[PDB]
């Protein structure tokens, strides 16, 4: 998973979640777009 | 092909009978100059070593334009000369041989990037003598270039930068020398294959002046002209070789 500092929506199925303060970008379509802290 | 439209180097060298073969190498320069001025080619003499009784022993000449190498591929080899030899005061027949090399352009894409991300720089303490600085400060730099395997060791001066500049200059010189040595070996391994020993053996071209015929092994050609041959007009001999070379 990607561990970048700036997080944008890559595809159309990206969703901005705020799990435990950690801003995550989840994707139900492609597992490669799931990433970490932003 | 890309090489086809490319320019060429002609290297006409004297073989057997260096007195006579220089006179025939001058005639081959005359041959390909009259063949070159017919189709409007540029002829520049890069190097020409003169003989004794006239002519030239070695001629290296660039011909530029659009399509020199692709039209002159099949000229590397030997040339037998049966003629009343200018030299003979007596006048008997002889085989004067000459060797012709045809080299392509191979344009120089020199000086690749030094790639400091690929350079492993080890800055460690120095050996030798001189002061306290040898104990604590490093003053010794080793740089290894990974895809080539070249190690440069510098322990010359006190500061590292003044040794970093020397180490990069030695890296540039050693990489340029190792590339130009491979290029000169690639030139020589092809020139040894194209140019033979220089003897009169039959190597693809046969010449016959007192008979009026030249026979070419490289696709037998038995055309008795040598007067529309001695002043340009060599396309016909060259053309069926290309015709049965494009079949393969």
């Amino acid at each position: 998973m990607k561990v970048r500092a700036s997080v944008k929506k890559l595809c159309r199925n990206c969703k901005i979640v705020k799990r435990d303060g950690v801003i995550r970008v989840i994707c139900s379509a492609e597992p490669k777009h799931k990433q970490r802290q932003g | 092909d890309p090489d086809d439209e490319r320019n060429a180097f002609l290297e006409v060298r004297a073989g057997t009978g260096g007195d006579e073969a220089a006179l025939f190498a001058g005639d081959l320069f005359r041959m390909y100059s009259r063949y070159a001025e017919a189709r409007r080619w540029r002829v520049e003499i890069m190097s020409a070593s003169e003989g004794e009784h006239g002519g030239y022993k070695e001629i290296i000449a660039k011909i530029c334009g659009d399509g020199v190498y692709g039209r002159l591929k099949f000229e590397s080899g030997g040339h037998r000369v049966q003629r009343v030899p200018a030299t003979e005061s007596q006048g008997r027949i002889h085989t004067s041989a000459c060797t012709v090399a045809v080299m392509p352009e191979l344009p120089d894409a020199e000086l690749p990037d030094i790639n400091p991300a690929d350079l492993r720089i080890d800055t460690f303490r120095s050996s030798g003598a001189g002061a306290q600085h040898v104990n604590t400060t490093d003053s010794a730099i080793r740089i290894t270039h990974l895809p080539t395997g070249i190690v440069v060791e510098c322990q010359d001066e006190r500061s590292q930068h003044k040794n970093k500049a020397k180490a990069l200059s030695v890296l540039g010189a050693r990489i340029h020398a190792a590339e130009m040595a491979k290029r000169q070996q690639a030139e020589a391994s092809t020139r040894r294959n194209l140019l033979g020993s220089g003897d009169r053996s039959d190597r693809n071209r046969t010449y016959n002046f007192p008979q009026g015929r030249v026979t070419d092994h490289r696709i037998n050609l038995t055309l008795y002209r040598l007067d529309e041959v001695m002043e340009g007009k060599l396309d016909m001999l060259i053309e069926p070789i290309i015709q049965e070379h494009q079949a393969d």
Binding site: - | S159, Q160, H161, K162
Partner: protein, 136 residues
């Protein structure tokens, strides 16, 4: 790299970047890249910002560069002590005031210029904004 040709002097003083901007209004194109942050832009930054803005806005259109550095900045060789004369001229900076028009573009849609000026702001260190030429 943008570089002046045969100026009167080779080296000049550092100076400060005080004062407000003069190039505020857009004068040539229909849009513009107005810079908000007070900073200094080297000539490599302008050349790279031209490179990664020109390719996305393709062979049509027209782009104006409203700034020119014309200010020489030196750099001392390393492991050389302080003093001993001013250093050798290395690069060229433009002192950019708050609200200074850097690039302008005409012949493009608004969304294409919006997406190109974001990349031009990403290639530059100073903060910019997006402006549009109002008539008078």
């Amino acid at each position: 790299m943008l570089q002046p040709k045969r100026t009167k002097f080779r080296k000049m003083h550092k100076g400060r970047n005080r004062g407000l901007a003069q190039g505020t209004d857009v004068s040539f194109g229909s849009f513009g890249l107005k810079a908000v942050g007070r900073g200094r832009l080297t000539a490599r930054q302008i050349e790279a910002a031209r490179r990664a803005m020109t390719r996305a806005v393709k062979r049509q259109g027209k782009i104006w560069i409203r700034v020119f550095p014309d200010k020489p900045i030196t750099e001392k060789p390393l492991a050389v002590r302080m003093g001993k004369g001013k250093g050798n001229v290395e690069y060229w900076v433009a002192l950019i005031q708050p609200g200074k028009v850097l690039y302008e573009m005409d012949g493009v849609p608004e969304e294409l210029a919006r997406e190109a000026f974001k990349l031009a702001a990403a290639k530059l260190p100073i903060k910019t904004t997006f402006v549009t030429k109002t008539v008078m």
